[PDB]
Design a protein around this ligand. Structure first.
Ligand SMILES: Cc1cc(C)c2c(=O)[nH]n(C)c2n1
Ligand SMILES: [Cl-]
Ligand SMILES: [Cl-]
Ligand SMILES: [Cl-]
Length: 163
């Protein structure tokens, strides 16, 4: 575990992370997809061997010895708010299990279901809180990656408000 487990946020490509493993915002079919998923596919294509996994689950595949945790958030275009909320919480719980199992001291994580799976809604708070609920009991350093400047400020504020 990390000596003083922390949360941090960076505004940059998660494919350039400085952590011991990465969480992919995957599709259920293990397809290269778009957004975070496509950047992960370009950086760690080997990790997409038998990466397909259901909504609300996480499946880890090694690129060399570097773990890629394929976490499948719900597409809120397809799910009800209620069911999508449940699956989004579940995907993060499965990430917490994988991070623990791997014995990593740090993990790079995007906000699941906040991009093309958001159903055209701002889910920063919903997704971040489910991330916290899952990861708070882990001792890995968590580094959240985002691309939007205002999202960076809002994530940084939400982290600092609990410290
Ligand atoms: C909306 C979005 C798109 C891309 C391409 C990335 C990325 O490479 N890292 N993050 C968190 C991203 N978020
Ligand atoms: Cl970048
Ligand atoms: Cl997404
Ligand atoms: Cl973002």
């Amino acid at each position: 575990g990390a000596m003083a487990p922390s949360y941090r946020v960076k505004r940059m490509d998660i494919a350039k992370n400085d952590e011991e493993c990465v969480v992919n915002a995957a599709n259920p079919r293990g397809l290269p997809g778009d957004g975070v998923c496509k950047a992960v596919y370009k950086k760690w294509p080997e990790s997409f061997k038998n990466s397909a996994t259901p909504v609300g689950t996480a499946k880890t595949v090694m690129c060399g010895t570097y773990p890629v945790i394929h976490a499948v958030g719900p597409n809120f275009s397809n799910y009800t708010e209620s069911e999508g909320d449940r699956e989004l919480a579940a995907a993060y719980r499965e990430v917490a299990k994988e991070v623990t199992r791997l014995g990593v001291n740090s993990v790079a994580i995007p906000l699941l279901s906040t991009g093309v799976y958001s159903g055209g809604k701002d889910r920063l708070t919903q997704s971040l809180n489910h991330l916290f609920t899952a990861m708070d009991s882990t001792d890995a350093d968590v580094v959240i990656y985002c691309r939007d400047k205002e999202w960076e400020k809002k994530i940084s504020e939400a982290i600092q408000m609990r410290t």
